[PDB]
Amino acid sequence: IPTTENLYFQEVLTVFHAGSLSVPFEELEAEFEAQHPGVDVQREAAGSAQSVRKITELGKKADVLASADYALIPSLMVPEYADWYAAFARNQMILAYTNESKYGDEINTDNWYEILRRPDVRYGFSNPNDDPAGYRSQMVTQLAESYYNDDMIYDDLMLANTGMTLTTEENGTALIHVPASEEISPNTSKIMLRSMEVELSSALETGEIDYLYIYRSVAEQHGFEYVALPPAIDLSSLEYADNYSKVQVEMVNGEVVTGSPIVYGVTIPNNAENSELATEFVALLLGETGQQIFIENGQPPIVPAIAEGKDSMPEELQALVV
Ligand code: MOO
Numbered sequence: 476i477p478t479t480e481n482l483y484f485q486e487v488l489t490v491f492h493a494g495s496l497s498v499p500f501e502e503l504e505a506e507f508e509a510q511h512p513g514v515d516v517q518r519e520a521a522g523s524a525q526s527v528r529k530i531t532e533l534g535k536k537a538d539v540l541a542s543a544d545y546a547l548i549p550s551l552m553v554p555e556y557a558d559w560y561a562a563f564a565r566n567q568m569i570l571a572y573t574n575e576s577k578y579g580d581e582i583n584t585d586n587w588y589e590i591l592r593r594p595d596v597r598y599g600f601s602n603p604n605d606d607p608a609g610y611r612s613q614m615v616t617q618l619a620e621s622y623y624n625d626d627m628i629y630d631d632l633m634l635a636n637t638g639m640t641l642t643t644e645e646n647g648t649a650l651i652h653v654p655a656s657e658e659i660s661p662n663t664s665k666i667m668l669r670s671m672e673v674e675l676s677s678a679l680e681t682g683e684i685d686y687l688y689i690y691r692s693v694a695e696q697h698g699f700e701y702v703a704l705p706p707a708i709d710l711s712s713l714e715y716a717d718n719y720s721k722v723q724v725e726m727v728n729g730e731v732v733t734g735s736p737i738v739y740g741v742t743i744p745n746n747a748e749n750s751e752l753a754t755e756f757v758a759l760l761l762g763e764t765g766q767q768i769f770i771e772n773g774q775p776p777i778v779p780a781i782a783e784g785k786d787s788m789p790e791e792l793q794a795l796v797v
Pocket residue numbers: 492493494495496521522523524542543606607608609671672673
């Protein structure tokens with residue numbers, strides 16, 4: 476029987492981070508505890524949007540907040556809960572699978588959506604209201620329409636199988652509306668939906684789902700075979716930023732996220748209890764040691780880190796940022 480520590484957090488350093496950061500932050504935890512004897516790092520892994528909402532709406536206090544989408548910090552935390560943030564890593568949306576997945580040896584970059592259209596094929600993605608990988612899965616599928624010249628890709632895979640709706644904005648931008656989390660109501664024969672993307676890893680391993688909308692790093696961390704989606708739709712390239720911006724996702728609470736290159740962001744909240752200790756953890760993260768942890772885990776780091784609001788940043792961190 477799990478204790479409260481075994482359920483919740485599965486001196487004190489409280490860190491709320493993204494699900495895809497579970498592997499590098501686990502190695503960062505062990506290294507930080509090795510350098511600091513009496514320090515117990517307590518990590519809570521959740522979708523980045525709900526990780527932010529714990530601080531901004533639930534009144535929870537964290538020392539370190541790390542998101543899969545850096546932009547959630549200035550749009551939701553700044554200026555009441557945050558005065559600064561730093562872009563530290565990059566990632567890539569892929570479609571993961573294993574040997575057991577149906578149509579495995581036959582799926583490639585030019586037919587992935589056609590495979591997902593099949594009634595026997597089941598696929599997974601996380602909750603877009605809570606997780607970046609969840610809303611990014613919708614972004615990838617919608618952008619695939621204009622790339623492959625097929626205006627029915629998003630309708631067949633998402634609109635006809637969930638509670639998601641779509642409207643066209645005045646500038647031609649597509650806007651995806653995500654209803655209440657319980658009213659998403661996915662077609663069980665076609666879609667499996669979790670709160671965060673990494674909980675769906677177990678589903679792909681057993682063959683409960685055939686394909687999974689997830690990051691490249693997570694696929695390499697688990698050893699899954701994957702489909703390298705075109706740079707124009709996979710949110711991996713800085714050059715295709717103008718193309719990615721033509722799709723937006725509105726959450727149930729009215730918050731709008733925009734298609735952009737996947738850029739991870741970190742910050743130390745304004746109401747942090749151990750801000751001194753948090754500084755040292757972020758220093759290890761943005762320093763050479765943190766950089767090598769990401770490279771070894773298949774996640775490319777932004778070296779040097781790009782920060783905003785440097786006049787509010789602690790002095791120890793200003794030597795590691797741009
Ligand atoms: O915040 Mo995630 O790394 O899209 O579970």
